């Protein structure tokens, strides 16, 4: 039987790595893209369809689930895996970003907030909620510093996050069933400042985690600045553990982040923008609602292997999205998630074959033509 957690790097090219995370509930191929399952569903997809696109792991949102249907309720019903019908690994966010984005009174103990009923979220309660959900990869409870941030405020926020990271570690370790069956990732903060990123990486490595997220990015800084911060931030993390870039991103963001040593990604872009009419293609995104697609018999993308591109035309999906039909959301979302997984597969294969630099160049030349 598989271990609780084992990350193995099979091949490297520059800072890029490809390999596997083995966990009780399954193997995760890296670099990995995690479809987002906000309220115990990857929107508009059955779990079997999520798996058919190639996903090895999905992300669940602690903040939404603790409000509806409730963490204790999900536990009483058998846990999130049974509840939604996904039997493979689930990574849960901690709620720290979402509570400040969607709900508040912050203190050293945690955050109290009103639902959008009053609720509480501390490091200890976040880890407990993730236990009740039955998460496989638990995220430490942190604070995502707003951008831009002054050096003083970025430092204060990062320092509190590091104290909360130790509290998260101890809460996780004090629950035997969780410690033996799940993994715990810590989150690097520090805004765009190299010295704070270094202090944060050092604090997290001293505590010790199964994986390390780069937090606090994709919050308005733009790709050039995000890449500049990744350039110095990823090498600060332990090389032998997974590196997770939270909330990223567009296809070109993913490619460049892999070039900088990132192993894991999540984003609502393929699901949310799919429902809004944006389809990803190797020649760049298209908006299927545009009148130019009304009689276009071609599939969404000319090479995509997904079931949507095997059967239905742009013209049909254009009609469905314009009409507000649920099937339009279903088909756009399946295609976009499949596109993301095909991107990850091409990334993994090209690193394994020592041709990822050429892949990145070819990808960009065509995607932005």
Ligand X SMILES: NC(=O)c1ccc2nc(NCCN3CCOCC3)[nH]c2c1
Candidates 47, 96, 211, 328; binder of ligand X (CB under 6 A) is: 96
Residue 137 or 218: which CB sits closer to ligand X? 218
Q: What is the DSSP letter of 23?
A: E
Cα separation, 280 vs 263, in Å, equals 21
3-state secondary structure at position 344: helix
Q: Active-site residue 240, yes or no?
A: no
The neighbouring-strand residues paired with 113 are 119
Count of residues engaged in binding ligand X, rule: CB under 6 A:
11
Does the footprint of Zn ion cover residue 309 (CB under 5 A)? yes
Does the footprint of Cl ion cover residue 98 (CB under 5 A)? no
- CB closest to ligand X, residue no: 247
Provide the token pair at 276: 């809004």
* CB of 338 vs Zn ion, minimal distance in Å: 5
- Residues in 285-344 at the binding interface with a second copy, rule: CB under 8 A: 294-295, 297, 311-313, 315-316, 319-320, 322-323, 325-327, 329-330
Q: Please state the length of the chain.
A: 369
Residue 93 marked ligand-binding: yes
Residues 184/177/159/99 CA torsion (nearest 10 deg)? 80
Does the footprint of ligand X cover residue 247 (CB under 6 A)? yes
Contact 35, 270 (CB under 8 A): yes
Does the footprint of ligand X cover residue 35 (CB under 6 A)? no
Does the footprint of Zn ion cover residue 304 (CB under 5 A)? yes
Which residue, 124, 141, 125, 235, is CA-closest to 185? Answer: 141
CA 121 from centroid of its chain's CA atoms: 21
Residue 157 marked ligand-binding: no
Strands 105-106 and 211-214: what pairing?
unpaired
Given the residues 93, 136, 210, 263, the one annotated as active site: 93
| Backbone torsion region of residue 299, taken as left when φ is above 0, otherwise alpha when ψ lies between -120 and 50, otherwise beta | beta
Cα separation, 4 vs 23, in Å, equals 5
Candidates 268, 307, 315, 327; binder of Cl ion (CB under 5 A) is: 268
Residue 244 marked ligand-binding: no
Residues 6+ apart with CB under 8 A from 307: 52, 334, 338
| Interacting partner of 271 out of a second copy, Zn ion, Cl ion, none (Cβ under 5 to 8 A depending on kind) | Cl ion
Helix or strand (DSSP H, E) at 19: strand 16-23
Does the footprint of a second copy cover residue 39 (CB under 8 A)? yes
Residue 216 marked ligand-binding: yes
- Residues in 84-103 at the binding interface with a second copy, rule: CB under 8 A: 84-85
| Interacting partner of 144 out of a second copy, ligand X, Zn ion, none (Cβ under 5 to 8 A depending on kind) | ligand X
* CB of 216 vs ligand X, minimal distance in Å: 4
Cα separation, 262 vs 260, in Å, equals 6
Does the footprint of a second copy cover residue 365 (CB under 8 A)? no
| Interacting partner of 306 out of a second copy, Zn ion, ligand X, none (Cβ under 5 to 8 A depending on kind) | Zn ion
Contact 31, 261 (CB under 8 A): no
Residue 342 marked ligand-binding: no
Provide the token pair at 173: 């370790």
3-state secondary structure at position 73: helix
Given the residues 56, 136, 266, 301, the one annotated as active site: 266
Q: Active-site residue 93, yes or no?
A: yes
Residue 93 or 301: which CB sits closer to ligand X? 93
Residue linked to tokens 């509480």: 120
Catalytic residues: 93, 266
Residues in contact with a second copy by the rule CB under 8 A: 39-41, 43-46, 68-69, 73, 76-78, 83-85, 294-295, 297, 311-313, 315-316, 319-320, 322-323, 325-327, 329-330
Residues that bind ligand X (CB under 6 A): 96-97, 142, 144, 187, 215-216, 218-219, 246-247
């Amino acid at each position: 039987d598989r271990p609780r957690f084992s990350f193995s790097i099979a091949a490297r090219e520059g800072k890029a790595r490809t390999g596997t995370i083995e966990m009780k509930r399954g193997v995760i191929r890296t670099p990995a893209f995690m479809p987002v399952g906000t309220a115990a569903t990857v929107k508009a997809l059955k779990p079997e369809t999520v798996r058919a696109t190639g996903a090895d792991i999905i992300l669940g949102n602690t903040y939404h689930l603790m409000l509806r249907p409730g963490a204790e309720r999900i536990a009483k019903l058998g846990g999130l895996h049974s509840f939604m019908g996904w039997d493979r690994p689930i990574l849960t966010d901690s709620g720290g970003y979402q509570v400040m984005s969607l709900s508040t009174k912050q203190s050293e103990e945690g955050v109290t907030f009103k639902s959008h009923s009053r609720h509480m979220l501390s490091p200890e309660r976040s880890i407990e909620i993730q236990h009740l959900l039955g998460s496989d990869i638990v995220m430490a409870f942190d604070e995502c510093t707003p951008y831009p941030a002054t050096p003083s405020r970025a430092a204060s926020s990062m320092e509190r996050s590091m104290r909360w990271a130790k509290r998260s570690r101890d809460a996780f370790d004090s629950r035997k069933e969780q410690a033996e069956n799940a993994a715990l990732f810590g989150i690097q903060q520090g805004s765009v400042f190299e010295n704070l990123r270094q202090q944060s990486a050092d604090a997290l490595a001293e505590i010790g985690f199964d994986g390390y997220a780069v937090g606090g990015l994709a919050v308005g800084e733009g790709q050039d600045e995000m890449f500049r911060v990744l350039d110095f931030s990823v090498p600060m993390l332990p090389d032998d553990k997974p590196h997770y870039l939270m909330g990223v991103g567009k296809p070109d963001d993913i490619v460049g982040a892999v070039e900088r040593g990132i192993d894991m990604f999540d984003c609502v872009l393929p699901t949310r923008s799919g429902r809004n009419g944006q389809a990803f293609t190797w020649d760049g995104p298209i908006n299927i609602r545009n009148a130019r697609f009304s009689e276009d018999l071609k599939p969404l993308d000319s090479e995509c292997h997904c079931a949507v591109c095997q059967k239905w035309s742009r013209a049909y999906i254009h009609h469905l999205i314009r009409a507000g039909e649920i099937l339009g959301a279903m088909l756009m979302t399946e295609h976009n998630i499949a596109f993301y997984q095909q991107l990850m597969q091409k990334i993994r294969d090209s690193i394994s074959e020592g041709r990822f630099s050429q892949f990145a160049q070819d990808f960009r030349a065509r995607y932005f033509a």
